[PDB]
Amino acid sequence: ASRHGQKGTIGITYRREDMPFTAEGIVPDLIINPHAIPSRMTVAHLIECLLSKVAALSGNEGDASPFTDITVEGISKLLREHGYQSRGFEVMYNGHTGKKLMAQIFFGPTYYQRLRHMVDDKIHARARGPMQVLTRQPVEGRSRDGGLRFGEMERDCMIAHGAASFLKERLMEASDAFRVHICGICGLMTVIAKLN
Amino acid sequence: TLSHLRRTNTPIAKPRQLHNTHWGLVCPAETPEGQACGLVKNL
Amino acid sequence: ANWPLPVNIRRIIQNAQQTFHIDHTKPSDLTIKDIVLGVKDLQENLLVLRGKNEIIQNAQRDAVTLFCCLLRSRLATRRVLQEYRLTKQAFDWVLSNIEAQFLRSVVHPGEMVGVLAAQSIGEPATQMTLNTFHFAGVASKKVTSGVPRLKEILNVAKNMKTPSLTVY
Amino acid sequence: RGNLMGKRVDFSARTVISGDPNLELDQVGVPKSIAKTLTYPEVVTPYNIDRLTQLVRNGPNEHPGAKYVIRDSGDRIDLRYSKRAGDIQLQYGWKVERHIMDNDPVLFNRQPSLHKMSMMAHRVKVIPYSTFRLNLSVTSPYNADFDGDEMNLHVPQSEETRAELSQLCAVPLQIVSPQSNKPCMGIVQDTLCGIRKLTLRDTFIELDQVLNMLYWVPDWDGVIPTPAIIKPKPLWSGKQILSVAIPNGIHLQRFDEGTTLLSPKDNGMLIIDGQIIFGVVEKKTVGSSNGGLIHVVTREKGPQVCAKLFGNIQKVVNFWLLHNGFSTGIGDTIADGPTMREITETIAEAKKKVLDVTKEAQANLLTAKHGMTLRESFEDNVVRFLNEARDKAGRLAEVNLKDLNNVKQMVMAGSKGSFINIAQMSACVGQQSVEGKRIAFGFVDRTLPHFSKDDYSPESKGFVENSYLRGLTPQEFFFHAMGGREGLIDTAVKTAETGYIQRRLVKALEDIMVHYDNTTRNSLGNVIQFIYGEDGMDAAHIEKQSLDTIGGSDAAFEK
Amino acid sequence: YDRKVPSPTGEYVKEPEWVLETDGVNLSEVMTVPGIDPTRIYTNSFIDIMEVLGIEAGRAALYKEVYNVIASDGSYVNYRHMALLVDVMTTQGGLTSVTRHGFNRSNTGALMRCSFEETVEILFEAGASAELDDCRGVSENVILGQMAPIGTGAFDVMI
Amino acid sequence: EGLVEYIDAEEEESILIAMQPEDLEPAEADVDPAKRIRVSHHATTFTHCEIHPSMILGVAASIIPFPDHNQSPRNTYQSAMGKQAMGVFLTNYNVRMDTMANILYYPQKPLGTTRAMEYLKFRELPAGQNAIVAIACYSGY
Amino acid sequence: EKAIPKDQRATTPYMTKYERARILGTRALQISMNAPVFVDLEGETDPLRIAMKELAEKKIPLVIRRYLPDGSFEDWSVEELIVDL
Amino acid sequence: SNTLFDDIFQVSEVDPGRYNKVCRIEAASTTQDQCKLTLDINVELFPVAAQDSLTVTIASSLTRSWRPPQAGDRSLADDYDYVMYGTAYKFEEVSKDLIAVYYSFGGLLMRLEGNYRNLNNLKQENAYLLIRR
Amino acid sequence: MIVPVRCFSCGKVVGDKWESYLNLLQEDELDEGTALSRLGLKRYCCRRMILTHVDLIEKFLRYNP
Amino acid sequence: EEGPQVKIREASKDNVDFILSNVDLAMANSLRRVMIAEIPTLAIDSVEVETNTTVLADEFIAHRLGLIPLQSMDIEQLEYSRDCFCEDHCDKCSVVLTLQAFGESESTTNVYSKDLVIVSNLMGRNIGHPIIQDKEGNGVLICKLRKGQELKLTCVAKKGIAKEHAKWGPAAAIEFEYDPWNKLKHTDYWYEQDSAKEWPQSKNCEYEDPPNEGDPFDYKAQADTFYMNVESVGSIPVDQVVVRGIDTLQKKVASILLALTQM
Amino acid sequence: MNAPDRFELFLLGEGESKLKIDPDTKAPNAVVITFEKEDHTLGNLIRAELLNDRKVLFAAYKVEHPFFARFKLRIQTTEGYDPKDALKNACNSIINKLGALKTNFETEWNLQTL
Amino acid sequence: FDMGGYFIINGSEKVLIAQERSAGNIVQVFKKAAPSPISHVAEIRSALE
RNA sequence: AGAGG
DNA sequence: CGATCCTC
Numbered sequence A: 001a002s003r004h005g006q007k008g009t010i011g012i013t014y015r016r017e018d019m020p021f022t023a024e025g026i027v028p029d030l031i032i033n034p035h036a037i038p039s040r041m042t043v044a045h046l047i048e049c050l051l052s053k054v055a056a057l058s059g060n061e062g063d064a065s066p067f068t069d070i071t072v073e074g075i076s077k078l079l080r081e082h083g084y085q086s087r088g089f090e091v092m093y094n095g096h097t098g099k100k101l102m103a104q105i106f107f108g109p110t111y112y113q114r115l116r117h118m119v120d121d122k123i124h125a126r127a128r129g130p131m132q133v134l135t136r137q138p139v140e141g142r143s144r145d146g147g148l149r150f151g152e153m154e155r156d157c158m159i160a161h162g163a164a165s166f167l168k169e170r171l172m173e174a175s176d177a178f179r180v181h182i183c184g185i186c187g188l189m190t191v192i193a194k195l196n
Numbered sequence B: 001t002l003s004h005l006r007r008t009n010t011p012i013a014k015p016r017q018l019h020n021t022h023w024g025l026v027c028p029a030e031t032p033e034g035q036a037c038g039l040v041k042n043l
Numbered sequence C: 001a002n003w004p005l006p007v008n009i010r011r012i013i014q015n016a017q018q019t020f021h022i023d024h025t026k027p028s029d030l031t032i033k034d035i036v037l038g039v040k041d042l043q044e045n046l047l048v049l050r051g052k053n054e055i056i057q058n059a060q061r062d063a064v065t066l067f068c069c070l071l072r073s074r075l076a077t078r079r080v081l082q083e084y085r086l087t088k089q090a091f092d093w094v095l096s097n098i099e100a101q102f103l104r105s106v107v108h109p110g111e112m113v114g115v116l117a118a119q120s121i122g123e124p125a126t127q128m129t130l131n132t133f134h135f136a137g138v139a140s141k142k143v144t145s146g147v148p149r150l151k152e153i154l155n156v157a158k159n160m161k162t163p164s165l166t167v168y
Numbered sequence D: 001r002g003n004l005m006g007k008r009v010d011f012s013a014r015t016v017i018s019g020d021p022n023l024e025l026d027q028v029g030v031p032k033s034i035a036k037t038l039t040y041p042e043v044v045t046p047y048n049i050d051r052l053t054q055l056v057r058n059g060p061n062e063h064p065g066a067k068y069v070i071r072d073s074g075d076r077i078d079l080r081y082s083k084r085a086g087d088i089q090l091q092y093g094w095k096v097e098r099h100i101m102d103n104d105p106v107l108f109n110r111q112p113s114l115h116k117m118s119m120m121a122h123r124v125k126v127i128p129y130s131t132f133r134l135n136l137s138v139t140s141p142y143n144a145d146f147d148g149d150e151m152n153l154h155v156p157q158s159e160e161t162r163a164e165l166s167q168l169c170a171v172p173l174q175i176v177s178p179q180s181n182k183p184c185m186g187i188v189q190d191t192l193c194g195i196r197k198l199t200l201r202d203t204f205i206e207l208d209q210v211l212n213m214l215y216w217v218p219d220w221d222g223v224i225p226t227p228a229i230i231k232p233k234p235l236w237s238g239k240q241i242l243s244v245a246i247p248n249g250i251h252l253q254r255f256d257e258g259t260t261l262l263s264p265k266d267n268g269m270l271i272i273d274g275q276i277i278f279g280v281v282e283k284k285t286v287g288s289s290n291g292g293l294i295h296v297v298t299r300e301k302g303p304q305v306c307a308k309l310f311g312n313i314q315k316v317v318n319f320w321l322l323h324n325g326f327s328t329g330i331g332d333t334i335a336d337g338p339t340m341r342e343i344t345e346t347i348a349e350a351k352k353k354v355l356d357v358t359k360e361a362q363a364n365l366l367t368a369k370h371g372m373t374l375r376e377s378f379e380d381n382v383v384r385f386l387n388e389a390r391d392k393a394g395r396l397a398e399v400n401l402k403d404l405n406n407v408k409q410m411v412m413a414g415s416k417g418s419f420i421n422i423a424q425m426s427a428c429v430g431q432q433s434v435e436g437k438r439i440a441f442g443f444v445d446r447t448l449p450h451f452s453k454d455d456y457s458p459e460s461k462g463f464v465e466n467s468y469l470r471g472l473t474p475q476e477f478f479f480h481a482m483g484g485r486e487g488l489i490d491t492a493v494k495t496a497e498t499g500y501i502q503r504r505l506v507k508a509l510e511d512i513m514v515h516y517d518n519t520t521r522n523s524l525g526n527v528i529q530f531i532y533g534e535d536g537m538d539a540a541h542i543e544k545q546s547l548d549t550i551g552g553s554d555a556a557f558e559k
Numbered sequence E: 001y002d003r004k005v006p007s008p009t010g011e012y013v014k015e016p017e018w019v020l021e022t023d024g025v026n027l028s029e030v031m032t033v034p035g036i037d038p039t040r041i042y043t044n045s046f047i048d049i050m051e052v053l054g055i056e057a058g059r060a061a062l063y064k065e066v067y068n069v070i071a072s073d074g075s076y077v078n079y080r081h082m083a084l085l086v087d088v089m090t091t092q093g094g095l096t097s098v099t100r101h102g103f104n105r106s107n108t109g110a111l112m113r114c115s116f117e118e119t120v121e122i123l124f125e126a127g128a129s130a131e132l133d134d135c136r137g138v139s140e141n142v143i144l145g146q147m148a149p150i151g152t153g154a155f156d157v158m159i
Numbered sequence F: 001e002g003l004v005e006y007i008d009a010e011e012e013e014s015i016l017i018a019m020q021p022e023d024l025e026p027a028e029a030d031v032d033p034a035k036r037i038r039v040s041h042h043a044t045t046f047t048h049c050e051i052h053p054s055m056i057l058g059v060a061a062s063i064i065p066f067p068d069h070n071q072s073p074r075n076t077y078q079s080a081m082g083k084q085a086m087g088v089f090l091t092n093y094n095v096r097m098d099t100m101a102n103i104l105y106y107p108q109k110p111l112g113t114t115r116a117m118e119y120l121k122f123r124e125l126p127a128g129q130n131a132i133v134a135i136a137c138y139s140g141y
Numbered sequence G: 001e002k003a004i005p006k007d008q009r010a011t012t013p014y015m016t017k018y019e020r021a022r023i024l025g026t027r028a029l030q031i032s033m034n035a036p037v038f039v040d041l042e043g044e045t046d047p048l049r050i051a052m053k054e055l056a057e058k059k060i061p062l063v064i065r066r067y068l069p070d071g072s073f074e075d076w077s078v079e080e081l082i083v084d085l
Numbered sequence H: 001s002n003t004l005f006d007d008i009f010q011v012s013e014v015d016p017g018r019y020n021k022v023c024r025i026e027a028a029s030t031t032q033d034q035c036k037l038t039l040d041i042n043v044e045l046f047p048v049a050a051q052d053s054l055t056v057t058i059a060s061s062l063t064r065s066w067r068p069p070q071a072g073d074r075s076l077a078d079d080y081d082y083v084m085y086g087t088a089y090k091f092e093e094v095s096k097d098l099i100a101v102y103y104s105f106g107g108l109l110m111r112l113e114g115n116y117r118n119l120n121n122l123k124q125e126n127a128y129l130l131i132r133r
Numbered sequence I: 001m002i003v004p005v006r007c008f009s010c011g012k013v014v015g016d017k018w019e020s021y022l023n024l025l026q027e028d029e030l031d032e033g034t035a036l037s038r039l040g041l042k043r044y045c046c047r048r049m050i051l052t053h054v055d056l057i058e059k060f061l062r063y064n065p
Numbered sequence J: 001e002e003g004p005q006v007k008i009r010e011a012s013k014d015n016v017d018f019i020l021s022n023v024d025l026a027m028a029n030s031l032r033r034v035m036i037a038e039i040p041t042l043a044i045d046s047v048e049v050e051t052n053t054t055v056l057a058d059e060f061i062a063h064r065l066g067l068i069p070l071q072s073m074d075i076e077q078l079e080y081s082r083d084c085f086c087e088d089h090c091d092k093c094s095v096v097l098t099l100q101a102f103g104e105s106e107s108t109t110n111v112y113s114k115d116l117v118i119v120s121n122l123m124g125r126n127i128g129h130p131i132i133q134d135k136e137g138n139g140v141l142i143c144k145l146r147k148g149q150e151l152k153l154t155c156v157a158k159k160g161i162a163k164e165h166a167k168w169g170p171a172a173a174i175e176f177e178y179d180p181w182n183k184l185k186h187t188d189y190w191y192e193q194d195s196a197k198e199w200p201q202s203k204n205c206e207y208e209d210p211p212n213e214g215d216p217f218d219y220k221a222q223a224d225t226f227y228m229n230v231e232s233v234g235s236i237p238v239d240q241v242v243v244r245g246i247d248t249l250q251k252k253v254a255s256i257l258l259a260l261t262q263m
Numbered sequence K: 001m002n003a004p005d006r007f008e009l010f011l012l013g014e015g016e017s018k019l020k021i022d023p024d025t026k027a028p029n030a031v032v033i034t035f036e037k038e039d040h041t042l043g044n045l046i047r048a049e050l051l052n053d054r055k056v057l058f059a060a061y062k063v064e065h066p067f068f069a070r071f072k073l074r075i076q077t078t079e080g081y082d083p084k085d086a087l088k089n090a091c092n093s094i095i096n097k098l099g100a101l102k103t104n105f106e107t108e109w110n111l112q113t114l
Numbered sequence L: 001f002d003m004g005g006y007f008i009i010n011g012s013e014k015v016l017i018a019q020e021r022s023a024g025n026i027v028q029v030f031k032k033a034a035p036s037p038i039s040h041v042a043e044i045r046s047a048l049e
Numbered sequence M: 001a002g003a004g005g
Numbered sequence N: 001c002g003a004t005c006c007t008c
């Protein structure tokens, strides 16, 4: 995540070659999408990037402090003094084909954070497994290889679809199921069945 | 850590709301989502 | 004018035009008899209910009242001729296509509408944002809306919040 | 509630979800490890025996393998330990608990499960890496994004249970929603943005690329279309190669605003025999629109054909855009020197309008109309003048944005953002509210201790003149934060509230179903409706169409 | 208020009209006032409509209201869905609530009512009143772990 | 020396605060269009002045660059988020025996800092890295 | 009793999705359990694909008991039911 | 097949309607007192100014998969400078004797008005536009 | 923690450059901008690598164990 | 000589600035890619840690060692250990470096790439010697030790390409530009007022003639003349990066020619 | 954890062969070669060159999914021209061009001083 | 860099979370709603510090 | 109760 | 007397 409420997972890794590149041969470490910008309305993210680019080039810290007189214009002015286009854009080349891109990419440094709750700490799968003592239903939590909850909300979706046998298997074959002996007179689980 | 040591809890006619009076006293941004939103404050 | 009905007739016409490579500068091969009696006959074939009796026959008649209005408004002589410029071969297929699509458009016994309706109102309910007033510009038209109103409605709340008579 | 209605289940999986432009709509990417855990009890028939022995041979750690062999009596041979794990001489009637393989039906879900579309049968495609991969165009019925969302996966254990999924719960079946009688999945994000960019008149493509774009469509006929331009350089328009993705017999007509039949602005839509004749392709065509390409392709060609369509559209548009490129930067929020002077002027006149109304109010002059306080009226006026200001200032900005403006570009495609965003980001943020009214006097007769008593000015009561580009002042900042907080607070309320509404609605209607006499009845067999929805029609099979006998003049009807 | 009313030529026209909006309900008395259209009169209080004009008008008003919330948001839900809900509350003679008060008090099977709210007490009066559950409801089969009379099992298969 | 005073919300009620020592009180009688609009200091009866308006924020928000250029709630989210981030939490991290300890291999000081970060010791003990980032439609992954 | 006669039957001549799905499941189950195939399985080995072929060829020997809310029913063979869908 | 139409036109207007490679051309026949023409042209390939005299031809020859030119001895029905390929999509009769044809050369539109568009311009995927001088 | 061997983005060996960098400031009374350039660090990906680096190891070695 | 043409503008031990005329985009690009990845080099691939009393972790150290550049001059004379007939490694396929450091001094002891020492028999090949460009002759600062602090490890350096791990990269950054005037109109400049005024003019512009205002767009033109700058880490010298880059590409094309023959 | 070995990018597995030549289903005289443990370095290079051949009617490559290091090349030639031949011709041209480049760069390098 | 201000209880580091309350001995007046027979109410939550 | 959407 | 999903 960037310092602007812009959390997101890695979608894929590309090695240096496959990445788009600047004519300097600079390449991204990250590729964030333009679509997560207009709605989120996080302009400081864009300002940060511009500020950081000037900062890296000039070798001077970027003043990102709030109630200041630092203007996008002032920053833009300095970046051009460093011979890059004023608004952070950069002509980029496709790493596959080598061809230029019709778009000039807004590219520069940005402080991104690594957050806890990484894939492998979350990935869980269960076939058969440990059953609870009282309920006789699959246990809870991945640590003890537990069963994921097929709640009532999920039950409803299945009812909607009209998948009666799936819903039956999901509540019997999978999870629970049990064979009880009942009286054809009182109907209670009294029957003291001496099997075999 | 610093953030955790500056936390405020408000138990229980609109406490969740950022009151004018909070200016310079409690942080306007910092607050959890949903659950204790506007009840858990930060100095 | 525009209301949700089964069988998109407009498309069927457009499809027939392309399928039969309709020549707009040629006289068709139908009769006033073909069109007029054709639609009249297609109407009888648009089945929802199937009981041999008068109660169910009226039930059927009622269920298609609106669709038939469309069917007839669209497939009337003048239009079939000067507008659509259809041919007997093309027109007949339209009648079979309408019947087929209509029959496909019908509900299936087993379709769990209870859950469906509930979820169909319930999911859009969750998507409701900043619900206090959005149906206001002045101060006179400031009535309780969104989830708090929907709650009033479902609870059949004896003690409302914005009781309002609108006198014409 | 939690042990009978709902319960923890076997043959289930969960992990973080991720986007995949190379997976089919109806597929789901399943990590090898997850595939290696979940099994399916297959009975040994002569039809399978050769695949089944080889699968028992691969064992529990090589992928297309198995975990258990069940035989006579019902004894489980554990392939991970058994001394005969490499011996096993299969017999018919025996079962082989095999690893979930490519193309198996699975139930894929995102919680909360508010829709029948939050639960969908997917085709397994075993993949490397740890995320559940999914086609971007299935994002919406699930209400998923990839910011860290996790999804659940359930495996059918019976031949009849797999059918239920593949024949009822399948993703292509789900395309046309019964909820709103319109489809529930369309061309979203990059592909939506790119499809607009590709479909412009200006967008022309050449042989080298054209050939790649064509090969990229799997259903490709293998016939190079004749370039719209044969003269110096054979040049294909974007519209052209994209019509390759559209199947034959697809006819679609629109007519936007200006739209003639000679479509001067390249607006509206005309597709004949599945070839785009005119009109730029964007949300209206390719989104989850009622009269959209998707509703048409589903109805005409079929669900499975339409599901394939999403794939082809994506493959082309994606490839094209991957090579074209698209960005968004700070420059895209910057609007003209003269525009800035004009937005400032717009706010300044609103500032005057308010001050004049205030001066008027203070002279005991203004007479409020019947029904409202002399003060109540004052605020409507001010707040109105101030919204007018923001909106007018915003429309000024939008107008100054070029056709090359990446924000304008996304809005135009309908891929992301609205007007308000342009307005707040570049022109002016606007008036902040809490409980309907503008910022209130929390301090005695002032909103902040930086103001004088009894100050009713735009600024004093939460009016943010600055845009996000310009930056907000501390007063603006705090006021915005007050308004912002209300959002987060009610979001918390609304989501908790609506969830309870849903459980009630569901529990109240649960047992209502259409019977074998078209009658909508409950468990007790009581009639709720005599014909479902007063017409005995299924909601998915219904569309808005104009009743031509109702409108126009009597002369116009006569003609 | 603005109104679409047909012109002498036949075409519909935007003929604007004067409409009064009230704070508070006394439907019973306002409709008997001269100079008004008692045909057209309306209240957001569908319960008053129910009492003054009958259950059918109640249903009509109850829908008009439910719809209004859905469209207020900007969203659209097919008529039939809201029509179903509205009809459910309606078919009873009066207005049955979408809470433990309304539908959870109804003649339904004991096991499907204990699935919603007031779980323990619903089953307590089931034993006291000596209730007989039909087991044809969704929830009953869900508890019993049998194939429910839902879509797929709403008919029997034979040779 | 009575150059500064401690004020609570109760006393706050009776005072008049200027936001800037300068901009809020020198003299009165060209401009920078890029700079934000600031209302003319019409009230001139000040009893106090703000040490710095940025001081309205606390620890987590004090980490955000330009929060003043952000939509109100994105500032709220980043606040909760930065507490889910990795880095040197302390120098003695490998002298302590604690459940869960996540430390960034090569943590770097943000190229864009707030003045408040000086006291928050952020550059001394950081939470992220200065990634070279591109806002682009690439493979659509 | 209760049984409605073959003539005088008001239910759809068409097979519901729910009927089709259950029929396909029940047959696919039998195929997968070494029960005989009533059609030429030209190239096919998938129990559902085989049931699908069997349905398309109308050599599925199963009948649907259509219950009505009064308790009465209507029996319809897979051979007789129209398969549009 | 062979030609279906040929005439010399006079450029009225040239409009880059928010386009930077395409232009909408407004033309009139040098012979006919009623014959109109509205057409989209790639003004990057064939730059068109004001009142330029243009020979505009509609043909149907010189379905089958496209083979690159890559043959010197291959001779196409042009000594022309600008050649397009389109589809017929509408045939609006502009009252009495006046008829208009609608051609889309891959989304580059054309509208030709007149009288004698008879046993020559039919609803055809066949449509070749040829411009001269 | 300690001066990364090689720039993440580009690969240019930044490992050897650190002592040299500190000295350049301390002794040669230079500023970061010239100091980075004087070490041949031209691309900004290489620049952030050294400029933004916080050397936690010096504090760490301060602990006796 | 015949096809592709080279013109070296500038050259040093670490960078080569040259123009590549009479070439197609694919070749220029495919050469840039092959330089990044596909060229084999020698890097530390296995670390045995006998002793580590440093503040740094075993694998954090092991990681850096991998990134130390080693003499990859005679790399084609070394086998990939996967093709070697030994049990694990040997001298035909690997180089063994040793590192022993102990903070004897009170003052913080620095552990350099210079401090690594070959123990393998190099059989007279310019291989495995850490690349030292640091003027003080130290190279990479692997680690810092206090006083008690000891570090005892043994590392096997193996042959490999960047396509497996970015440590095997001999190059780093390749500057690459074609048509500095956008005569090709291969890009579309984003602007506020004037594209020419708003975009900085490329250094290669003086190597090409401007478009001349009122000239029609050259539709037929294809890009041929690619302004490049190949930089090296020092494992292999610059001339080799490009020569071996070319050579590898030839080799992989030649395997396809050969694969058609076994078919 | 679920990530496959980096050598899987360039090393052929058991049963895996480099080129897999399949006759195109639709078009006449067209072929589809699956290239194993290769990317855009080879794909774009062969494809670009095949276009320089006048008797090549169609030539296009694709890498169906990034996870896997393989590419598909579809080639169509004129009647009597086998695409396997148009491929080997394209391959040989590439080699020759590269030869000259190596030679020319080497020559240039020997003329420079530093 | 440690700031202190926490407790160490059985090796675990504890933070005493500042608790919000209304100040006592404060006179506040409340307009009571429509059904009650009392128009307004004057309160004081007195205590001994 | 701590956090994740 | 109830108050959205998930795990730890």
Ligand SMILES: Nc1nc2c(ncn2[C@@H]2O[C@H](COP(=O)(O)OP(=O)(O)OP(=O)(O)O)[C@@H](O)[C@H]2O)c(=O)[nH]1
Pocket: A039, A040, B033, D145, D147, D416, D417, F077, M005
């Ligand atoms: N339908 C739709 N929703 C959007 C659009 N843009 C943003 N949103 C929504 O705006 C909200 C804010 O984005 P997020 O910060 O990711 O919301 P979140 O992931 O649920 O995290 P929380 O803020 O804790 O709720 C989410 O509900 C998004 O789905 C849009 O263009 N269309």
Ligand SMILES: [Mg+2]
Pocket: D144, D145, D146, D147, D148, D149, M005
């Ligand atoms: Mg999310």
Ligand SMILES: [Zn+2]
Pocket: A183, A184, A185, A186, A187, A188, A190
């Ligand atoms: Zn008994």
Ligand SMILES: [Zn+2]
Pocket: I007, I008, I009, I010, I011, I012, I043, I044, I045, I046, I047
């Ligand atoms: Zn670098």
Ligand SMILES: [Zn+2]
Pocket: J079, J081, J084, J085, J086, J088, J089, J090, J091, J092, J093, J094
């Ligand atoms: Zn060896």
